[PDB]
């Protein structure tokens, strides 16, 4: 947490979450979670002007 | 509420609501609220003859 950024104010690594891995054990349920969360990953990378 | 508009009767800034931000955490659910509320937004902006 002290050394997340190159210079404070440039951008964060970002972690994101898909599910609990117990409720998400089903294959198609896991797939929809990943696809829906890849949208947020696109946004999280854009928020840092990447 | 006193100064929403320049002259009474021309138009209102409009506020609109999407969700509770607690049950709307799912990006799929959140996007549906935004899309559904965007249809209302063009209606509210039309009633002012914009």
Could you walk me through the main structural features you see in this protein, from its secondary elements to its overall organization?
This is part of a larger assembly, with two copies of chain A (50 residues). The first copy, chain A, is an all-alpha fold. The first copy, chain A, has one helix and no strands. The first copy, chain A, has one helix at 27-46. Chains A and B meet through helix 1 of A and loops of B. It is classed as virus. The entry lists the keywords Podophage, icosahedral head, virus. The entry is titled "CryoEM structure of Klebsiella phage Kp9 icosahedral head".
Secondary structure elements and their pairing?
This is part of a larger assembly, with two copies of chain A (about 50 residues).
Chain A: H1 27-46
């Amino acid at each position: 947490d002290s050394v997340n950024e190159n210079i404070a104010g440039l951008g964060k690594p970002s972690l994101l979450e898909v599910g609990l891995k117990a409720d998400l054990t089903d294959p198609v349920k896991l797939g929809q979670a990943v696809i829906a969360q890849l949208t947020i990953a696109r946004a999280a990378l854009t928020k840092n002007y990447v």
